[PDB]
Amino acid sequence: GKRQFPDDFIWGAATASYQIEGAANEGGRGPSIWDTFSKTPGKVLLGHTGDVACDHFHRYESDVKLMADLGIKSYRFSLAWPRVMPEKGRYLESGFDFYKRLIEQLHKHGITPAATIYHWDLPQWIEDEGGWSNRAVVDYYKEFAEQAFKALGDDVPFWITHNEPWCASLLSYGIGEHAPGLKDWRRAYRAAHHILLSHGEAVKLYRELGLKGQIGITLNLTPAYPASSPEDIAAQQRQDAFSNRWFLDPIFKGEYPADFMPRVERFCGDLNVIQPGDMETISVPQDFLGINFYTRSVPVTDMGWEIYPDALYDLLHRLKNEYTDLPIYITENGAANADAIVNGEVEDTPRIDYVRQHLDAAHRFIQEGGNLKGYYLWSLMDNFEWAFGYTKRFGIIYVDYETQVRTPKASFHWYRQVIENNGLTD
Numbered sequence: 001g002k003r004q005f006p007d008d009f010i011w012g013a014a015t016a017s018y019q020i021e022g023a024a025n026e027g028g029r030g031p032s033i034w035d036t037f038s039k040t041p042g043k044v045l046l047g048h049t050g051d052v053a054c055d056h057f058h059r060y061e062s063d064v065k066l067m068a069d070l071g072i073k074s075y076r077f078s079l080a081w082p083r084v085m086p087e088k089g090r091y092l093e094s095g096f097d098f099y100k101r102l103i104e105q106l107h108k109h110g111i112t113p114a115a116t117i118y119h120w121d122l123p124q125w126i127e128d129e130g131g132w133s134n135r136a137v138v139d140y141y142k143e144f145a146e147q148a149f150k151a152l153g154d155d156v157p158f159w160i161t162h163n164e165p166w167c168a169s170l171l172s173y174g175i176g177e178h179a180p181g182l183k184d185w186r187r188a189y190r191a192a193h194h195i196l197l198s199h200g201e202a203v204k205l206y207r208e209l210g211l212k213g214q215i216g217i218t219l220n221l222t223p224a225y226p227a228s229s230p231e232d233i234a235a236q237q238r239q240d241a242f243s244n245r246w247f248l249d250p251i252f253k254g255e256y257p258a259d260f261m262p263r264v265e266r267f268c269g270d271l272n273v274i275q276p277g278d279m280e281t282i283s284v285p286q287d288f289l290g291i292n293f294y295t296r297s298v299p300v301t302d303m304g305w306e307i308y309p310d311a312l313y314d315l316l317h318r319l320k321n322e323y324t325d326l327p328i329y330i331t332e333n334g335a336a337n338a339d340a341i342v343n344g345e346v347e348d349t350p351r352i353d354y355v356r357q358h359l360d361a362a363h364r365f366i367q368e369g370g371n372l373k374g375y376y377l378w379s380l381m382d383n384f385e386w387a388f389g390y391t392k393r394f395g396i397i398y399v400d401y402e403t404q405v406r407t408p409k410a411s412f413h414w415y416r417q418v419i420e421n422n423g424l425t426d
C-alpha cells in the first residue's frame with residue numbers, strides 16, 4: 001500500500017552555487033578555483049564553465065515559484081565565498097545581497113532555507129596560498145562563516161558547514177578530477193584535515209553567537225562491499241576507510257582510522273598537519289549528520305553508477321548502530337538520466353524509479369526506529385556537472401541552456417505528489 005513518512009518529515013531539493021548561479025563576473029565576484037579550472041584547456045568536457053550556468057542569480061524569483069509549485073518545505077543551496085571575499089584582504093558585505101533576496105522569496109512561499117557554507121567554490125586567491133593544504137585556510141573559512149552567520153543568521157535555521165570533504169580533498173588534490181586538480185596525496189590528506197578542522201571551528205562559532213537553529217556537516221558516503229576470502233574482506237576495509245571512515249571516525253570518534261593511517265603515511269610520508277586540540281575541535285557535537293548517497297562499491301544510471309538502494313538502507317543502519325543517534329538528513333540523492341524534451345515534456349521514468357527505490361529504503365529505516373528527518377533530491381534543476389560540464393543532467397527540472405527555459409520533468413510531477421501525500425503511493 002502507501003509508505004507514509006513521519007508527520008514532520010522534511011522534503012527538499014538541493015543545488016550548489018557554482019553549478020546554477022552564473023553571474024560569475026558581476027557585483028565584484030572574484031574567481032573561484034572552479035573558474036580557473038573550467039577555463040583551463042582539458043579540465044572540463046567541451047570546455048564548459050559556470051560562467052552563465054542556469055543564470056539563477058538573475059532568475060531566482062521564477063525558480064522559487066517552481067519550488068512553491070513543487071511543495072518542498074526546504075531548499076538547500078550553497079553560499080558563494082568568492083562573492084564575499086573576492087580578493088585577498090577584500091570583504092564585500094554586498095556579496096550576501098543575492099542570498100538575502102533569495103531567502104525573502106523562500107520565506108514568502110513558506111520554504112525554509114538550508115544553507116551550505118562551502119560547496120567547493122574556494123576563492124582562487126586562497127588556492128594561490130596553498131588552498132586547503134595551508135592551515136591558514138581555517139581562519140579564512142572562519143572569517144567567511146562568521147560573516148555568513150551575521151548576515152543571514154536569523155533567517156537560516158539549518159546550516160551545513162561543508163559539502164563532501166572527500167571530494168574537496170581527495171578527489172581535488174589527490175586524484176585531480178576536481179578543482180584545483182592536483183595529484184598529491186600528502187596535499188590531499190592535509191586538505192582533508194583542514195576541511196574537518198574548519199567544520200569544527202564553524203560549529204563552535206555558531207554556538208558562541210547564540211543562534212537558535214541547527215548545524216552539521218554533509219558527507220558523501222559510498223558503502224564498500226567484499227567480493228568474497230580474508231583478502232577480499234580486507235580490501236573492503238581499505239576502501240571503506242578511504243571513502244567513509246576517514247571522515248566519519250574524526251567527526252564522531254575524534255580519531256582517524258588507525259588501520260588506514262599507516263597506508264596514508266606510507267604513500268604521503270608525514271602529514272605534519274595534526275596539531276594538539278585539532279581532533280577535539282573536529283569532534284565538537286553537531287545537531288545533525290547530512291549524508292549524500294548515490295551508489296556503492298565492490299543496472300546503472302547515466303553516470304554508469306550501480307543502482308543499489310539496499311546500500312542506503314544498510315548505511316543508515318550502520319550510522320545508527322556505530323556512529324550516532326543524531327538526526328540524519330539525506331542532503332542529496334538522485335540520478336543522471338539521458339534526458340530529452342519531446343513535445344515540451346521530459347519522460348524521465350528511470351529517475352522516478354531510482355528515487356522511489358531509495359525512498360523505500362529510507363522508509364524501511366524509519367519503520368525500524370531510524371532517526372531520518374529529511375530528504376533532499378539532487379537536483380532541483382539540471383546544472384553544471386563539474387568535470388562533465390552540461391553534458392549530464394540530474395535535475396527534476398530540465399534547463400535549456402540556450403534559452404534558459406525551465407521545463408519540469410515527469411520526476412517533478414511525481415515528487416510533487418510524493419510531497420503532497422507525504423510518502424510513496426506508487
Ligand code: NA
Pocket residue numbers: 120167168169171172178179
Ligand atoms: Na571537489
